[PDB]
């Protein structure tokens, strides 16, 4: 790195501890706020009940009417 | 300021080896430095050296040949055992055809190939290839 001593280990991994949070992959897997916001809640499949049907207008040139469902 | 006596010595001679000088002037002379090049005397990588042994930090003038492409300095001085003398050469040396890792031990400053013989590793200095 930038500091190159022999007993700088606390200078080393504390200067690697806090920008691990600025990495998105480490922050996502260790901050539970998105885990709370995960509507699966740690799952992969979920049952659902329909209340209406919603037609979604598509994007820029590739345009159509998309069949979407309120769940 | 001046932190290392051996790192600046190898950087000064590598700055002139790419240029092609035959005689250079290195500002320090340490106990480690004067017997550091004696390893290259037994390996024939650099020509014979003359020093100015005075009441100051002496100046060493070494004869320059082309046999040493680059001598490397590592900072700081990591500890090396014989459970990992094969470990560094996988990332540090070009091969076992040539390339040398030098170490300073209780036997003295000495090479990894002969460190296998006397069975003593330890405090390390650098590598020349």
């Amino acid at each position: 790195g930038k500091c190159r001593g022999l007993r700088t280990a606390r200078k080393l991994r504390s200067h690697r501890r806090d920008q691990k949070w600025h990495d998105k992959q480490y922050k996502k897997a260790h901050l539970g706020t998105a885990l709370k916001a995960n509507p699966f809640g740690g799952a992969s499949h979920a049952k659902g009940i329909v209340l209406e049907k919603v037609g979604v207008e598509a994007k820029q040139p590739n345009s159509a009417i998309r069949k979407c469902v309120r769940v | 300021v001046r932190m290392n006596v051996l790192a600046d010595a190898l950087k000064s001679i590598n700055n002139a080896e790419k240029r092609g000088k035959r005689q250079v002037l290195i500002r320090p002379c340490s106990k480690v430095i004067v017997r550091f090049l004696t390893v290259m005397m037994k390996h024939g990588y650099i020509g014979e050296f003359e020093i100015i042994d005075d009441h100051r930090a002496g100046k060493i003038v070494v004869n320059l040949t082309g046999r040493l492409n680059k001598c490397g300095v590592i900072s700081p001085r990591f500890d090396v055992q014989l459970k990992d003398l094969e470990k560094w050469q996988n990332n540090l040396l070009p091969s076992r055809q040539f390339g040398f890792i030098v170490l300073t031990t209780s036997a003295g400053i000495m090479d990894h190939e002969e460190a296998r013989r006397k069975h003593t590793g330890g405090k390390i200095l650098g590598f020349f290839f």
Partner: protein, 83 residues
């Protein structure tokens, strides 16, 4: 380059520059052999033998070519030692 048993396995041995004491690459397009004629000690005329030298292209592109060959020819006695 020779093997365990002692046979030269390399397909050629590359040249060496005599100034910087380093080898010459296969695609070095500026390396030059200096061909120096031999002068007889009593006749002064051409003999039939040479004192060949070599210079690399990097020394040419900084400008230290002639200073080296003067030093190279001093050791071989071509340049006068009194100077």
């Amino acid at each position: 380059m020779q093997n365990d048993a002692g046979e030269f396995v390399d397909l050629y041995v590359p040249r060496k520059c005599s100034a910087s004491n380093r080898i010459i690459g296969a695609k070095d397009h500026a390396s030059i052999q200096m061909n120096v004629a031999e002068v007889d000690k009593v006749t002064g005329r051409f003999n039939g033998q040479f004192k060949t030298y070599a210079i690399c292209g990097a020394i040419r592109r900084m400008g230290e070519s002639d200073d080296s060959i003067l030093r190279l020819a001093k050791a071989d006695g071509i340049v006068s030692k009194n100077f």
